[PDB]
Amino acid sequence: VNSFSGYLKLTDNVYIKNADIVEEAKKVKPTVVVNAANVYLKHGGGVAGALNKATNNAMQVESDDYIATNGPLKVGGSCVLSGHNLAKHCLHVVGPNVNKGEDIQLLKSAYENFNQHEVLLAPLLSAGIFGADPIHSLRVCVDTVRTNVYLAVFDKNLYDKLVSSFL
Ligand SMILES: O=c1[nH]nc([C@@H]2CCCN(c3ncnc4[nH]c5cc(F)ccc5c34)C2)o1
DSSP, rough: OSOOOOOOSSSSSEEEEEOOOHHHEEEHHEEEEEEEETTTTTOOOOHHHHHHTTTTTHHHHHHHHHHHHHHOOOOOOEEOOOOOOOOOOEEOOOOGGGGOOOOHHHHHHHHGGGGSSSSSOOOOOOGGGGGOOHHHHHHHHHHHHEEEEEEEEHHHHHHHHHHTTTT
């Protein structure tokens, strides 16, 4: 038993809720919140901008030090940093950004990072401003992640479409 509430169960291990991941993170304090990161960890908008704003820019400060030491992430890759006031840890995962022409097949590699964590609160990778079809992203998530994932979907309309079209 864990503290996630109001989720609809899609599979053995995947759950979905219409929620603001920032507010969901603020109430649950999960062990891991996933950020929809880019390779530079520049948290300017979308989920990343909202998560970073909720940390009062501490996420960005930590991220800039990470990049200065390690260089950029790979598309499909990830790093574990602090969760600040939102979670114990933040798993920054880089899904492909369709608006940059990145290969959508890298979406599976991106979701594989979730398997290193027993339980996660996460957005749909490559959705929103990253330009992928959230229904495809959900399918890849279900077919790739084997650990327990609680998906927060900000937009109520998209949430309803994802549930109603789920196979
Ligand atoms: O048309 C819409 N509406 N919503 C979206 C996307 C869906 C996939 C990723 N993404 C999110 N997913 C889950 N929680 C979120 N909290 C946020 C706060 C913000 F300021 C910006 C984005 C999000 C967000 C928005 O596409």
